[PDB]
Structure 1
Amino acid sequence: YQQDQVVKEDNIEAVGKKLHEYNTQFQEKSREYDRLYEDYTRTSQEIQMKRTAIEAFNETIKIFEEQCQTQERYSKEYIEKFKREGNETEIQRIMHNYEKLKSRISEIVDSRRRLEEDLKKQAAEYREIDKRMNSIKPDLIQLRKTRDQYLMWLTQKGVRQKKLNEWLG
Structure 2
Amino acid sequence: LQDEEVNEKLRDTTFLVRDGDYTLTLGGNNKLIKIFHRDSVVELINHYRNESLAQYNPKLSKYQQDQKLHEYNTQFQEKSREYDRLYEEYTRTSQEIQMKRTAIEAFNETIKIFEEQCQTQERYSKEYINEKEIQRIMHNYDKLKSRISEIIDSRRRLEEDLKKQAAEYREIDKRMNSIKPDLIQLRKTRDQYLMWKLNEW
Q: TM-score, normalised by structure 2?
A: 0.63
Contact 1:19 1:151 in 2 (8 A): no
Cα drift, residue 110 of structure 1: 0.7
Cα drift, residue 24 of structure 1: 2.6
1:38-92 deviation line (CA, Å, top 9, x unaligned)? 110011111111111111111111110111121122333322xxxxxxx222122
Residues matched between the structures, number: 139
Structure 1 residue runs of 5 or longer lacking an equivalent are 6-17, 80-86, 154-162
Larger relative contact order (C-alpha < 8 A, sep ≥ 6)?
A: 1
Q: Distance in 2 between matches of 1:122 and 1:72?
A: 39
The ranges of structure 1 where at least 4 consecutive aligned residues each deviate by more than 4 angstroms after the TM superposition are 1-5
Contact 1:151 1:164 in 2 (8 A): no
1:96-137 deviation line (CA, Å, top 9, x unaligned)? 211221111011111111111111111111111111111111
Cα drift, residue 95 of structure 1: 1.8
Contact 2:100 2:158 in 1 (8 A): yes
Q: TM-score, normalised by structure 1?
A: 0.73
Cα drift, residue 3 of structure 1: 7.4
Cα drift, residue 145 of structure 1: 1.2
Q: 18-27 or 96-105: which moved more?
A: 18-27
Q: Distance in 1 between matches of 2:115 and 2:151?
A: 12
Q: Distance in 1 between matches of 2:105 and 2:154?
A: 13
Cα drift, residue 37 of structure 1: 0.8
Which residue number corresponds to residue 12 of structure 1? none
Q: Secondary structure at the match of 1:78?
A: coil
Contact 2:64 2:192 in 1 (8 A): no
Contact 1:23 1:147 in 2 (8 A): yes
Q: Secondary structure at the match of 1:147?
A: coil
Q: Distance in 2 between matches of 1:113 and 1:106?
A: 11
Structure 1's 136 and 115: CA in aligned 2 closer, same or farther, altered over 3 A?
A: same
Q: Secondary structure at the match of 1:107?
A: helix
Structure 2 residue runs of 5 or longer lacking an equivalent are 1-62
Contact 1:47 1:119 in 2 (8 A): yes
Greater fraction helix: 1
